[PDB]
């Protein structure tokens, strides 16, 4: 109860004393200040004073960074963010989760940087899709740098899907081309075909039938594409759009190949009409 708020202040006081400096001790005691800020934070949190818990975690982060302790600074920034989420102020957490990720790569633990960015992306989805797409791209860049290519592609996938949901189809197209190259490099051909489905859905949605047909043409040189169901289905779709056959276009857009796509593409297929 009130016991805990009392303790939190005692801890901030001790923190401040540790940072105080003297001719006999001429460098603040950053390590001990950090411990105390951590303890203030935990106390405020238990007392349900979330905003105060968050400010204490920021002090702890500062203290750790000042003590060259990058992993622990990062951990503390993440805790401040999670206080902000818990307060229904997730937008305000972003800056701190980003600061943490910089500290995580600086430290030689880039996986952790990419997961903090992924995690934040997902929590930003209900709030601002653009920023969510941005975090996911940031996560992908990190994964790419430490050469984790499955991981980076997966994240670009998330951004592709959300750009479709946002109806930024130009961007969605660029994102899907990038995905497709990555899976092509990794030689994951079955997944390339699916990207081609999505690429065509997007282009038909822009009513850019030429671009749509170009994706299919380009994909013929991806091994195993010409003889796949995926390609058969896209050829039927294009044919139907070209001949303006509504029955066929609706049928294809509602076949399992297409409706089992990720939700954002399946929907985009649902809404497609003959020109």
From TrEMBL:
<comment type="subunit">
    <text>Interacts with RAB11FIP5. Interacts with VTI1A.</text>
</comment>
<keyword id="KW-0813">Transport</keyword>
<dbReference type="InterPro" id="IPR000744">
    <property type="entry name" value="NSF_attach"/>
</dbReference>
<keyword id="KW-0931">ER-Golgi transport</keyword>
<dbReference type="GO" id="GO:0005794">
    <property type="term" value="C:Golgi apparatus"/>
</dbReference>
<dbReference type="GO" id="GO:0016020">
    <property type="term" value="C:membrane"/>
</dbReference>
<dbReference type="GO" id="GO:0016192">
    <property type="term" value="P:vesicle-mediated transport"/>
</dbReference>
<comment type="similarity">
    <text>Belongs to the SNAP family.</text>
</comment>
<comment type="function">
    <text>Required for vesicular transport between the endoplasmic reticulum and the Golgi apparatus.</text>
</comment>
<keyword id="KW-0653">Protein transport</keyword>
<keyword id="KW-0333">Golgi apparatus</keyword>
<dbReference type="Pfam" id="PF14938">
    <property type="entry name" value="SNAP"/>
</dbReference>
<protein>
    <recommendedName>
        <fullName>Gamma-soluble NSF attachment protein</fullName>
    </recommendedName>
</protein>
<keyword id="KW-0472">Membrane</keyword>
<dbReference type="InterPro" id="IPR011990">
    <property type="entry name" value="TPR-like_helical_dom_sf"/>
</dbReference>
<dbReference type="GO" id="GO:0006886">
    <property type="term" value="P:intracellular protein transport"/>
</dbReference>
